[PDB]
């Protein structure tokens, strides 16, 4: 795996 958490992993 996970680079961006939450909104950033979209």
């Amino acid at each position, epitope marked *: 795996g996970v680079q961006g*958490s939450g909104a950033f992993g979209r």
Partner: antibody
Framework: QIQLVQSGPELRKPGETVKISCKGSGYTFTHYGINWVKQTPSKDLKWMGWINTHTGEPIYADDFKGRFAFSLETSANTAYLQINNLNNGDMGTYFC??????????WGQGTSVTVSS | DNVLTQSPPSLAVSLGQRATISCKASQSVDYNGDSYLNWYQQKPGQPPKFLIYAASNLESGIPARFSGSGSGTDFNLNIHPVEEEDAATYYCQQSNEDPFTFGSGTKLEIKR
């Protein structure tokens, strides 16, 4: 046995610079983002932004745009936070955290920063 | 920003009883079927501890005495039975938008 371990407490005079490390172990470091979180003296939690550990690209929260820099030394499995031109408002504890799909799962232990002459 | 308001600021609960902590968001955190809202537990001297994600999903390794509910703007953390180890500050956090925001926390005190 996964952990994030940060560097120790730091004291600086106003106007100086601090660089703080966060070393990840027990997993592939370049596969997970690192977020930075400030805890103020009054204990408020503020998200500062994050760094993509594969591309090296940082994103800063609007509150942390200017004097704050996220960097990497991936051969050390380490992310850094640098704070330039320190003022009294930068006092607090700084945490690195690993990105999770929804949350922030693994946390470093905190690095306190004291600003004093 | 999406401002998270928690209540009460603190509370005292007798051992074995239920603690209920509320988190209210100024913007909906719903995206594609999921609520992007997480709960942490913090003890002084320690980092926050990841308890619950996506409103109601317990992080692996966390006791099932902790449970979360809600969607949209209105969320609750429930702790039952309250235990000695549960004295801490509890924070909600949204990840639906930049910047991520935390509530200012609810301190749980234990009565014995």
């Amino acid at each position: 046995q996964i952990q994030l371990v940060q560097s120790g407490p730091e004291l600086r005079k106003p106007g100086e610079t601090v660089k703080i490390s966060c070393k990840g172990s027990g997993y592939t470091f370049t596969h997970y983002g690192i977020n930075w979180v400030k805890q103020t003296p009054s204990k408020d939690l503020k998200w500062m932004g994050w760094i993509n550990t594969h591309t090296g690209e940082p994103i800063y929260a609007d509150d942390f745009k200017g004097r704050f820099a996220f960097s990497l030394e991936t051969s050390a499995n380490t992310a850094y936070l640098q704070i330039n031109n320190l003022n009294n408002g930068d006092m607090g504890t700084y945490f690195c955290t690993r990105s999770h799909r929804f949350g922030l799962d693994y946390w470093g232990q905190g690095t306190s920063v004291t600003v004093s002459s | 920003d999406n401002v998270l308001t928690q209540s009460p600021p603190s509370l005292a609960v007798s051992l074995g009883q239920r603690a209920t902590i509320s988190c209210k968001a100024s913007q909906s955190v719903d995206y594609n079927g999921d609520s992007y809202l997480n709960w942490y537990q913090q003890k002084p001297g320690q980092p926050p501890k990841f308890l619950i994600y996506a409103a109601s999903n317990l992080e692996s390794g966390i006791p099932a005495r902790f449970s979360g509910s809600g969607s949209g703007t209105d969320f609750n953390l429930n702790i039952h039975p309250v235990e000695e180890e549960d004295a801490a500050t509890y924070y909600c956090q949204q990840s639906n938008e930049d910047p991520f925001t935390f509530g200012s926390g609810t301190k749980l005190e234990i009565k014995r």
